[PDB]
Design a protein around this ligand. Sequence first.
Ligand SMILES: [Zn+2]
Length: 56
Amino acid sequence: ATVVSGQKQDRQGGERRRSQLDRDQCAYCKEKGHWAKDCPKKPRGPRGPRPQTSLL
RNA sequence: GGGCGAGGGUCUCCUCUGAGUGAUUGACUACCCGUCAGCGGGGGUCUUUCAUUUGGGGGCUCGUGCCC
Ligand SMILES: [Zn+2]
């Protein structure tokens, strides 16, 4: 058996242009489902994150 | 079979392009300003040329010279 697949991830080859992006991806980490402005791998401000809920 | 030196593929880490802006130019010209009312200057737009932007490291693997 050989599976007929190779689990390729790409995002490399010689250039770093829009070649691995779409309007549903992140310019910073190349994930699909969010944009760089909300990247789960990038810092936030002005002095940390900005939540909208709390508990007591 | 292993090490050392170089490179390719692949993954990984540093990961942020989401169809911008300015100047040159022929024509047309929303709009504004001055006109002997003929036009003239600024402004808008399509064409146009130029500038602004394209890297690196590490693992694994393939490969090769030398060494063991
Ligand atoms: Zn992201």
